[PDB]
Structures are given as C-alpha cells and as structure tokens.
Symmetry: C3
Subunit: 423 residues, 3 copies
C-alpha cells in the first residue's frame, strides 16, 4: 500500500529520517541495536544492486559496442579519459585548497622526527594494464572484474556488428540472435533496477542510520574539522568543476543534478560506486537520454578509474597528516601530491582495497611513511575513525563525476536526447 | 542389447543385487575391492547427475517463472513453505516416537556427569537469509549455490514476462529470444537426464554395493536397533503423513509412489537430494504432469530446505544419545527438540555440512554438548559409524517429501495434469 | 599504420628478428631490459589468445557435435585417439634414437649410487577419468578445465540435434535458437582470432626475443647437444612421421605445412598448446577446410592429450640423465620408457603442472628418482635450465601433430574441403 507514494520523495524522506534517527540512536548509545536490527535492510538493498552490476554491465556494453562504430568508440574513450584525468586533478586541487582553508589537523600537535624507513613498491602499472585483457572471460565474470568484462564486451559487440554485415544469411541470423539475447538480458536488468528502486528508500534510511549511529559521535574536534573540509571540497567540486564544465559544453547543471539525484543518493548511502552502477546507468538512459553506446562504456570505466571524491579526500587527509605531525607541505610537495594522486588512480585500476593503497602512495610521495607506531600512522588511524562519514560523500561525488563526464561526451558526440531537457 | 530391457526392472534389479552383493562381500571382508573396482561406476553415475543440476535448475526456473503470474508464484511459495515446515515438524515427531518404541541406545550404558561447556553456536539467521540474494549470479552459478540461483532465475523470468507484455516489438522479440534460449537449454538438460537414466542401474548397483560392503558389518547390536528404528520411522513418514496428506487433497497415493519410484531410488543410492534434483524434476514433469512454473520452483527449494528424513534421523539420534549416556529426555525437552529442528532447517538454509550443524544445534538445545572425550561425543561417533546406511533412507524420504508437496500444491492450483493419473 | 603489410610474412619477420634480437641482447647481458620492456608485448599477445580459448572451444564444439551424428562422432573419436597414441609412441621412439645418436649427457661424468625414492604420484586413472565428467559446467568454464567443457559441449550438441528432430514446433524453435546463439558466439570468436593475428607479429617477436635473451647463453656444452638432439628429433617427427602419414592418406605434406605455419609459429613462441588452440582451429577451418564437427572435437582433445614433442623431449632427457649419471638404459628399459611415456600422456590427462609429473613418472619407471641432492635431480635441473628453449619446439610439434591428425581423420571421413588444396 506504500508503493503508491512517489519514489523520490520516499528516498529523500528515508535519507533525512535515517540521518536524524542514527544521530539520535548514537547519542543514546543504541548503535549496536541499529547494527543488529536496522542494518540488515540496507545490506539487502546493497546486495540487490550488486546482484545486477555484472549482467547489466556485460549486456549493456555488448549492445552499446554493437550500436556504434569502433572509431567513434575510440574517440569517446579518448574524450572520457581526458575528462577523467582533468577532473581528478581538479578534485585534488580543490581538496588541498579546502584543507588549507580549514587548517585540518593543526591542533593535533604530534611530534615527528626526520626518520625514514623504506617501504614496498606500488602494484605495477604494466601488470594492471595487461590485467585489463582477461585470460578467461567467464572467470572475470565470476570474479566481478569490471575492466576485463568491459574489454571483452566491447570486442564481442564489435565482432557481432561486423558479422551482421556479411553476405551469408545464416551468419547474420546467428549474430542477430546473439545480440537479441544480450538485449533482452539488458532490458530485464534495467527493469529490475527500477523494481529495486521501490525498496530503495528503506535501504537508504537503514544505511544512513547505521553510519550516523556508528560514527556520529566521532565528528568532534579535529575529525569534525576534517569532515567539514571534505564535504565543503566535494560541494565545490560539484558546484565549480562540474557546473562550469557542464555550462561550457552547454548542459543545464540544475537539470543534471535533478536527474542524477537517484544515483547520487544511492552512491551516498551504499558508498560503492560499482554497486551504484545499475542505478547510475538507468539514470543515464531513462532520465538524461544518453545513448547506450556511450554510457554502457563510460559508466563502468568511470566507476573504476574516476573518483573525484576520493582524490579530494586524499588531498584533505594528506594536508591533515602533514599538519598533525607538524611538517606542513611545501608547494612543490602539493604538486607532487596532485600528480601522484592522478597517476595512482590510473595505476590502481581495478585492484581491491585501492583506497588504502592510493592513500599510502600519496603519503609516501611526499615522504610521509606509514611505519607502525609512528605519528604518521597515528594520524592516518585518526582519519580512518570517520572513514564511513567521509566515504558517503566521496562515493557520491565519484558517481556524479562519472555522470557529468558521460553527459558531456554524449553532448559532444550528438548522442544526447535533447527532448528530455525541455519543459 | 541393454537399452531394450525395461528401465524400472533394471534399476530395481540393480538396487537389490547391489545390496545383496555388498552385504556378501563386506561380510567376507573384500570391501576394499568394492571401493577399488565397483565404486567408480557409482561415482560416475553421481557425477553425471550432479553435472546437470545447475543448468537444469537455472533454465527450468527462468522458463517456469516466466510462464506464470507473480501473484500465483507467491501463493505457491507460501503454500509450499507451510507444507515443508509442517512435514519437518511431523518428521521430528515420528522420529521421537519410533525412538521411544525401539528403546534405542538403552543398552550402551555409558556414564555421564552433568557438566557442559559450550562449543558450537548457530550461524546468524539474518546473514543466512541475506545470503539468498546473490551479489554475483555468475559466481553463484559457478559455486553451485542453489538458493541464490533460484532467486535470480525467478527475478529474471518475471522481468522477461513483463517485457513480453510491452508495446514495442523489438523488446518483445529480445525477451522472447532470451526465454527461448533458456527453454532450449532446459529441454536439452531433460533430454540428457533421460539419457543418463539408461546408465542408472549400473551406478545404482555400484553405490548400494559399496555402502553395503563398507557398513553392513556394523548393523549389529545397538546400532542395528537404530537402523531398524530409523527406517521404520521413514516408512511411517511415507505411509501416514504423505499418504494422508495426498488423500486429503484428492491424490491417489499409490499412483504417486509408482511415479516417484525413479527419483526415490536415485536419492536412496546417491544420498544427495540436490544431486537427485534432475531425476526429481523430470519425474515431476514427465510422470506426474506438474507444470514447470510449479516444480521448477518447489523441487530445488525442497531439496535445499526440506529434509523430512534428516529431521526424523535427528529425532532418533537425540533419543539414542540421551538413552546411551543415561539421561532420558523430558516431554518439554522433546517439544524443544521439534521446535529447534524446524527452526534449524531454516537457519541452515544452504550452508555446507548443514547436517552436523543442525544436529549440534538440536543437541545443544537440550544441553548435550559435543566436547571431545566426553561420553556424548562417544555416542555421536557410534551413530556416525552407520551414517551412510541412514543417509540412503533419509535422503530418499527428503526427495519424496519434495515431490509430494509439489504434487499437492499443483493439485490445489489446478496446475496438475490429471490425464497422467488415469489408469487403463 | 603497418597493418597493410601482409600478415604471414610479418609473423615470419617477427620470429626471425626476435630470435636475433634476443640472442644479441642476451650475449651482452641486457636480458633484464628485454624482460622489462620487450616481454610485456608478447605477454599481451599470449593473454589475447588465452582469452578466446574457452568460448571458442565451448561454442565450436556445441555447434560441431550438433552438426554431426553420434555414431560418426564416436568413430572420429576412436580414429583420432588411435592416431594420438601411435604418434606419441613414435615420438618417444624418435627421441630415444636422436638422444643415443647425439650421445647426450655422455660428457657430464657424474657419480651416482643406486638409491631410488618415489617423488610425486600419478593421479589414479579412475579419478582422472571421472574428473573428465564435470560436476558443474559453469565451474569448469570458470576454471578453464578443457576436458569437462568438451564433454559438456558434446552432450549439449547431441541433445540439441535430437531436439531439432521433434514433432512439437516450440521445442524445435527453442533448440534452434540455442544453437543459433552458440553458432554466433563461435563465429564471433573466429573473427576475433583473425583480428588478434594482426598483433601476432609483435607478440611473436617479443616472446622469441625474451626466450632467446634469457636462455640463449645456456646452450653450450652438453646442454647444447641436447638442444641439437631435441630439435633434430622434432624436425624428424615433422618430416618423417607426419609427412609419411599424410602421404599415405593422400595429403601433400608441403601444402599442410604451408597452411599450418601460423599455428606452428604461434605454438613455438607462446609455448602453450591450449593458448594456440584458437589459431589452430581457425587454421583447421579457414585454411585446411576441415569441418567443424571434426576439428572442434579433435583439436582441443589433441591439445590436451597429444604431445609428440613433449614425448620426444622425455625420450631425450631420460637418456641424458642416464648417460650423465653413468647408467645407460638397457633395451627393456627403453621399451619401458616408451610404454610409460604413452601411459603417462593418458594418465595425466588435464592435470596442472603435468610437464614435471610425466617426467618424474618416466624417470621413476626406469629407476631414476628425484631425491633432493642426488645426481639425478642435478641432471634434471640441468635440463630445466634450457627447458624453455626446448618448450618452444615442443609446443610447436605438439600443435603440428594435432593439425596433422585432424586433417587425416577428416580425409578419412570425407569431411575435408578439397578446393583449398588445388594449385
Ligand atoms: C526482496 C523483496 C524486495 C521487495 C521490493 C518490491 C519491488 C517493487 C514492486 C514493483 O514496483 C514497480 O516495479 C516496476 C518495475 O518495472 C517499476 O517501473 C519502473 O520500470 C519501468 C521502466 O521500463 C517503468 O514502468 C517505470 O519507468 C519505472 O517506474 C515501478 O516503478 C514500480 O511501481
Ligand atoms: C558416459 C556415456 C553416457 C551415455 C548415456 C547413455 C545414452 C543411451 C542412448 C540414448 O538413450 C535414450 O536417450 C534419450 C535422450 O537422449 C532418452 O529420451 C528420453 O528423454 C526425452 C526428454 O525430452 C523424453 O521425452 C523421451 O520420451 C525419452 O525417451 C531415452 O529415454 C533413452 O533411451
Ligand atoms: C599494433 C597492431 C594492432 C592490430 C590490431 C587491429 C586488429 C585489426 C584486424 C584486421 O585484420 C583482419 O581482421 C579480420 C577479422 O576481424 C579478418 O577477416 C577474416 O575473418 C573471417 C572469419 O569469419 C574470415 O571468414 C574472413 O575470410 C577473413 O577475412 C582478416 O583476415 C584480417 O585481415
Ligand atoms: C571497506 O569498504 C569497502 C572496502 C573494499 C571494497 N572493494 N573495492 C574498492 C576499491 C576501491 C575503492 C575506492 O572507491 C571509493 C573510496 O573508498 O574512496 C568509494 N568506495 C567508491 O566506490 O567510489 C572502494 C572499494 C568495497 C568497500
Ligand atoms: C557427507 O557428504 C556431504 C556432502 C555435502 C555436504 N554439504 N551440504 C549438505 C547440506 C545438507 C545435508 C542434509 O542432507 C541430507 C543429509 O545428509 O542428512 C542428504 N545429504 C540429502 O542430500 O538429502 C547434507 C549435506 C555435507 C556432507
Ligand atoms: C607456460 O606454459 C604453460 C602451459 C600450461 C601450464 N599448465 N599445465 C601444463 C599443461 C601441459 C603441459 C605440457 O607442456 C608442454 C611441454 O612443455 O612439453 C608445452 N608447454 C605445451 O603447452 O604443449 C605443461 C603444463 C603451465 C604453463
Ligand atoms: Na576525474
Ligand atoms: Na566500488
Ligand atoms: Na566513480
Ligand atoms: Na518438511
Ligand atoms: Na544435498
Ligand atoms: Na529434500
Ligand atoms: Na601423439
Ligand atoms: Na597456459
Ligand atoms: Na598438442
């Protein structure tokens, strides 16, 4: 009887009520009760979306790569990769600026020497690039590996179209049947995404409630200042980077935000961009009128290697650690931070646990090593205390950047349905 | 020269001859030879049947969920879950009764104090229920996890039907092509099931022979009384619970048993219900006239969370252990046993080794802890010595209960083909 | 920009140039540079080929087993298995002959006792044969298990054909749709194989260069004789065994080598028969005109259980070790070597790491045990020092034998397209 209420209002109600409920439950210490009785519903929501992530990616990208020329696909790839790199660098820049504004970690007052102990190397860029090419596509499917599925789906769709243009009719009909199987699978997946969005408000409520209950009490003092800095920086990344980039390429930013709100809230509460990918793709298709041959390629790739929010978070935490141990970063050191954050977002393409590897890389780049028992590790552990509070906002901005780049590239390729943007 | 012989006679001959052969070979101690030369054929049979389980489940259920309304699907689910819980409770009750009748373990005479230190714990019910929803369906397919595949296949079939009732023709044609792929796969699977049933007598013979050769000598003394008890209870669970439930809803029980015979014997010799699933569904379709939209959903669900024979076995062994260590169970304790056995069938939905987790849970419910070196662990090992002899019958009764509940629900939903139930 | 150059000549140029480049770089000690900068390209080639192996096998075999009668399928299986066993025995015989000819290991002069302790075990024939039948075909697909996928695809194709000959129309149309899906998948796979053969020269160059640079310096002294022996034997296995078997059944051997050159060079540089399988199947179809219902079954089966080159290598290395420790093999011992080499080719059907298992098995068959610190283990390590130089030729001859047997069985079943064999 509740399905009749509109979904977007229900999701916003769940968000607001879960935030307030979690704060109130953590203020009275019932956070364990929230983890035991309320959290499983949000976990169910996240499982329902993660269920859809792999089939929708495989099928939608086979279809899209079929419904597009290889030259256009490569041009779109170059465009979207340039967008991703530029926006990530801008996110690190905004993170450093907002950190210097908030003066994060200035009152932690830890003593640190000039000692330096050599650590291990980051995972090889070459091996990750080779790992883009799978050695068993069924295996990469079972393992949830996005980038190799992207590669295989693109190759499969291109082969299918080249087969549909043959003289023999049996070959054409076989390729047509195969493409129909993928299209029916994709349609079913998007249908199910729409179905799951009906339960989405409950999961939104439960997830925001659990996070607020477990980490609301920790947002005081310097960690509170960190939270304020990170969220301000994210806000700027949307309102300056994304809005100016959308106006430069002629897209109404407010309509963009209104359409993306669903993927935004899903990413904010699930804190997993790849797990928001189904809602993100459904917003790209059935809200913004982006063609499948664009978003079916850019959105998984973007969920994997485009995290503006993570880059801004890294800029803030590196300023925090440097100011907390008492060695503020020189200008050239912050330039190294930006360069290393972008190159490390690239180099960490699809590995698990990439957040901490990237953060360790950025810290090591300026000579802040995570030796155990050292003040640097201490400040890093301080930051990790509010990691979920930060993860919400950073994942939201990651998905929002994915969508903005998708829309910009689609507008530049005239693959954007303008009829969705006129009132 | 082989295929021309009738199949039912061949499987029955293989069962009986393998039982006698295994008994005779194990009584004279050549059981190792049976393990080396005879068992691999039964192993081949089990592998051939296990091979089909995942494709046939996925395809049959996508097809069935497509060819049915979501409201009817929900009604069937509620019906079959009520049937399953009621029959499991009835099985624990029958196990307790037959155990009290045979006075199992009364002459083991072990000394036991009243000390108990907690060892096991239940796997969280919430996490088990959440694990039903997969997070990667390709992975769940690869790992053989039935319940998440069931969930994904139902969601996919419903989406396919909702797409076929759309206005655009391209969407209809894509959804129909997909449903045809799944239907062709399922048809191929059932074809292969029929083909493998030709080799079934050899594997049946080998399996019953190996089990009889390895565990025939052990059916003496108190364990003998256990076997005689357990099988009796299993028999009663078939003859009273199933037959009365079938006559209540207007199903001739003898026709039901005659049709289920193939799945019954397969479950009895392979001792894995999910591994019997292909024969069970092929019997449900091509023998009992159950609609795919019913059995394609109930039979795997029943193989996973409906084990009447295992519940009756638990009822028997709890009385056995309590009588062996010298502490017979109170009436209220037996009621708690029934309640916890039913709740534990749910709580172990799809976990590996669920038999022992459920048994440990039921024992702990009445305060019998399996600390090593204690007399309770000793009696439990006594019981585990004949686990295969018991596993045959209990798995058979698990599969038979699945089939009976499926036919009952199909009769109540007018989804049952009456033309298959008329004799000439 | 170089794509316009013909492909086969480019593959030959890459082979020769990589051999020379690797030799030159390894003699001057720059092998690390080759491993760091050159090898990743050959690795990319090998991963690209490995990607296709599972889909092409599954789909091509479903199609072929569908498009053939079960009686003919069984006849073809018997024929190709007899061919495989005969050629493996012949290869062991040639290996023993060329080893005794080159007097391999005669000048190592190691002292050896008479101790014999068993190392690894053979997997029980019963358990391996049972393992041929999968218990989850999705699992075998994900794990790359070739033999169970072969079994499942054959059973599925036979079921599909039996369904297409039914009276109900829904059954016919469903099975027909499924077979269309598998046919489209296989067609797409062969298309992509052809596409990857465009990058094949780069990978050929890189692989041969890396191998020659890392193990070129080691081909001196007694090991040099081993190389001289092994390749000689390999050469003989091609020019006597295969040529006589092709001439007996009326196939011009030179045309066969000309058509097979692609799979030959791919096997030689990638050293993986299953990884050459796509090129091998494409050569069987679009060069030799072998029907899918033949090669789609014999070629994966041959890559798995037909290794003439490996058998010849075993024949050479057992004589090498026996002469190195000072106990040359009696006539009955060499007969035991041949028998056990064939029986071990059968018994290790599909196990991982079978290369070392088979060699340890044959050595144990003649009483040469790999106890650590023993001289037998020492000679085995000597051979493993040049195992890669040997592996190139070994895989090449394994794949060539696969193709030769496929063409012979196809000629005997009148499933061979003669129009490709006219000058
Ligand atoms: C584990 C148990 C979880 C319980 C969750 C309950 C599932 C929700 C019940 C179904 O609700 C409907 O599902 C449709 C699915 O199609 C949605 O249509 C959506 O999808 C279609 C897109 O083609 C369009 O009808 C609409 O744009 C779009 O609202 C529609 O909103 C919604 O009312
Ligand atoms: C390790 C090697 C294993 C070899 C397995 C042995 C194969 C035996 C030869 C074929 O035997 C027939 O195979 C058919 C299927 O292939 C079956 O059709 C059956 O299956 C159909 C299912 O659609 C039914 O409709 C038919 O009525 C029914 O005859 C049939 O019963 C069976 O006699
Ligand atoms: C830095 C270098 C990187 C290079 C990567 C770029 C890949 C471009 C591939 C171009 O090569 C063509 O690919 C076609 C397949 O895509 C082949 O068609 C072939 O494939 C069909 C198979 O269906 C056959 O029937 C046809 O006869 C046959 O022309 C064709 O032979 C081949 O020339
Ligand atoms: C402890 O929680 C975990 C832990 C591990 C995983 N698996 N893989 C993975 C890999 C990388 C990330 C970084 O991405 C963003 C961020 O964290 O900065 C944010 N989450 C986003 O999705 O955009 C995130 C996850 C998932 C959740
Ligand atoms: C000993 O071999 C095995 C093989 C697999 C496992 N893991 N999963 C599992 C889960 C539940 C059961 C209970 O089901 C019956 C029983 O045993 O009571 C009987 N098997 C049947 O299929 O109906 C049995 C197994 C454990 C042991
Ligand atoms: C690097 O390549 C490989 C390839 C496969 C694996 N896995 N298991 C396996 C399987 C087979 C072999 C036989 O080996 C042949 C030889 O050497 O005579 C030659 N390599 C060949 O493929 O025909 C050896 C091993 C590991 C590495
Ligand atoms: Na970016
Ligand atoms: Na993620
Ligand atoms: Na992202
Ligand atoms: Na029950
Ligand atoms: Na089971
Ligand atoms: Na059952
Ligand atoms: Na051979
Ligand atoms: Na390999
Ligand atoms: Na081979």
């Amino acid at each position: 009887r509740y399905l009749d209420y509109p979904v977007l209002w229900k999701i916003l109600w769940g968000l607001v009520l879960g935030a307030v409920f979690g704060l109130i439950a953590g203020h009275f210490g019932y956070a364990g009760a929230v983890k035991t009785y309320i959290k499983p519903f949000g976990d169910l929501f996240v499982r329902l979306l993660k269920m859809l992530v792999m089939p929708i990616v495989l099928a939608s990208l086979v279809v899209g790569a079929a419904s597009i020329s290889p030259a256009r696909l490569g041009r779109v790839g170059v465009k979207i990769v340039v967008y991703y790199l530029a926006t990530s660098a801008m996110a690190v820049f905004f993170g450093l600026i907002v950190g210097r504004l908030f003066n994060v970690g200035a009152n932690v007052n830890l003593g640190s020497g000039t000692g330096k102990a050599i650590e291990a190397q980051p995972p090889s860029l070459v091996q990750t690039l080779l790992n883009i090419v799978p050695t068993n596509p069924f295996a990469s499917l079972a393992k949830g590996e996005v980038l190799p599925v992207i590669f295989f789906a693109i190759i499969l769709g291109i082969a299918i179209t080249y087969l549909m243009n043959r003289n023999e009719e049996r070959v054409r009909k076989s390729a047509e049947t195969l493409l129909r199987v993928f299209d029916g699978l994709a349609e079913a997946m998007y249908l199910i995404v729409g179905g799951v969005m009906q339960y989405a408000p409950i999961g939104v409520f439960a997830l925001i409630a659990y996070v607020m209950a477990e980490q609301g009490v920790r947002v005081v003092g310097p960690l509170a200042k960190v939270v304020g800095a990170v969220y301000t920086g994210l806000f700027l990344q949307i309102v300056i980077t994304y809005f100016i980039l959308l106006k430069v390429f002629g897209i109404d930013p407010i309509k963009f935000i209104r359409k993306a709100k669903d993927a935004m809230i899903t990413a904010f509460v699930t804190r997993s961009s790849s797990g928001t990918l189904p809602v993100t793709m459904r917003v790209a298709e059935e809200e913004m009128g982006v063609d499948k041959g664009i978003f079916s390629f850019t959105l998984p790739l973007g969920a994997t290697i485009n995290m503006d929010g993570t880059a801004l978070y890294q800029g803030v935490t590196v300023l925090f650690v440097a100011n907390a141990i008492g060695h503020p970063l020189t200008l050239g050191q912050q330039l190294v931070v930006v360069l290393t954050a972008v190159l490390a977002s690239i180099g960490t393409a699809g590995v698990p646990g990439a957040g901490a590897i990237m953060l360790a890389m950025v810290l090591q780049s300026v000579g802040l090593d995570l030796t155990p028992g050292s003040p640097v590790a201490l400040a890093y552990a301080m930051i990790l205390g509010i990691d979920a509070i930060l993860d919400m906002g950073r994942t939201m901005v990651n998905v929002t950047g994915d969508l903005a780049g998708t829309v910009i590239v689609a507008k530049t390729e005239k693959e954007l349905d303008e009829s969705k943007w006129i009132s």
